[PDB]
């Protein structure tokens, strides 16, 4: 039994980035293999990959992820 | 038994980012695998992948993700 | 049983991105393989992926993934 | 069963972005593969990708994906 | 049985985006394969894909995917 | 003065090549630009281009090239 | 002055390449090139350019290139 | 005086390359710039520029380059 | 005076490579530059620029070069 | 005065190279520079640039480069 639940149940600045940039090369969430069985990725909440990358206020609410890999049983 | 739920029952500044970039290269959520037997990718919630990437206000609500990968029984 | 299941019940700024860029390559969610069995990519949210990826309040209510790979069985 | 539900019941600023750019590649959700057997891409979200990419207020209820993949049973 | 179920039951700012580009190369949703046995792609949502591709205000009801992809059984 | 002069005065095994190939994309004498004055080629030889090239004894006499380029003067 | 001059003056094996290729790019004499004056290419001898590329006693006699870019004066 | 001058005057085994390759980029004679004045590529000999590239009894006589470039004067 | 001159008077074995290769990136003569004046190649002799790159008996004769670059005199 | 001359006048086993490699990549002359004046390469000889380079009796003869680089006099 793999089960995820999620609820969310409502009853109801500055932010400056200044970039100057050159040559920029950027990897977020990477997973490189070789000879693997599985490549799971689960994204419940936020991947934010700029050269510029700004996240405000984001993963702000009832994220559930259940992974269940592998098992040979 | 792979299961998800979710729910979401509502009884219902300034940002910024100024980039000057030469040469951007950005990968974001990278699987990159040689002899597999999976790749999955779950995206419940945001992947921003710009050169410039802005999230704002972005992941907020009831994400549910149940990933079974394998399971050779 | 892989079920997913999502309920959204209502009883019902400033955002400046100013980007200036030469040779922009952007990857969002990639997966390469050689020899897989299985390559799965679910999207419950947002994949924003552009050179300039701004996402505002995007991903805001009641998502469900149910993933099951594999079972040999 | 791979069964996906969804339900939405109800009972009922500035965001700028100035882009410019020379020589822009993107590429968003990939699956790059040889030799594969099953290659499933469900979007029940959003894929914003462009060179600029704005997504606002986008993914905003009730999403339901059920994926069963493989099974060799 | 792979079912999929949508119900939506409704019982009832400004957005500059100043895009100058060239040599935009855009890729979305892509699966490149070879010697596959399947290649599945639901969109229930949305896929924008643009060089410059805005999506306001978009998916925002009752998306359901079901897919059940393999099942040599 | 731009001269050029050729004279010729004449007073009188296996080559095996086996290519199998699958994608080949071949450039030869390339010369891309923006914003020139003067792009010239010559040849007095030989441009041998192909996906399997063979040049067998192929510029074997009296060969002249006088190029003058700019001279703004 | 820009002279040149070329004379030929005439009183009077196995080669195996066996290639076995898939994705094959190439490229020669390339000049790329951004805001330029001059852009002079002079081939007296011999370019070849396969995937495959023999070239057997090729460049065998009185070869003369005499270039003269530039020269503001 | 930019003078070349050549004089050919004449009073007159096994080679066995076997390549098996997968993904092979080459690059031979680049000149790759950004804002230049001049730009020159003489050839007066042998540019073999395979994947597989076998130069076999090639500049074999009398060869001359005279190159002059600049020269503000 | 940029002379070159060049005279070739004439009063007239196994070679076994076996390659296999994987993923082969070559660069040869490569001049790449950000804000030159002058960008000069000659090649009077060999270049030979394989994956595989066989040059036998090749630069077997009286060859000469004669660059002068700049002179702002 | 830049002055190159070359004269070349004539009165008149086993090599095995077994190589098996995966993710070659190969630089050979390679000049880099940012803010420059003069590139000149001048090549009287022989570059062989394999991922394999076999070169086997290659400058054998009678070879001249004179190089005048500058000279702001």
Same mark, same amino acid.
């Given at each position: 039994?793999?089960?995820?639940?999620?609820?969310?149940?409502?009853?109801?600045?500055?932010?400056?980035?200044?970039?100057?940039?050159?040559?920029? @090369? *950027?990897? /977020? $969430?990477?997973? &490189? =293999?070789? %000879?693997?069985? +599985?490549?799971?990725?689960?994204?419940?909440? !936020? @991947? *934010?990959? /700029? $050269?510029?990358? &700004? =996240?405000? %206020?984001t993963? +702000?609410?009832?994220?559930?992820?259940?992974? !269940?890999?592998?098992?040979?049983?």
């Open positions: 039994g793999v089960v995820a639940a999620a609820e969310k149940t409502k009853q109801g600045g500055v932010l400056y980035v200044g970039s100057k940039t050159k040559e920029g @090369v *950027v990897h /977020g $969430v990477a997973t &490189v =293999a070789e %000879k693997t069985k +599985e490549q799971v990725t689960n994204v419940g909440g !936020a @991947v *934010v990959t /700029g $050269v510029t990358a &700004v =996240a405000q %206020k993963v +702000e609410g009832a994220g559930s992820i259940a992974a !269940a890999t592998g098992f040979v049983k």
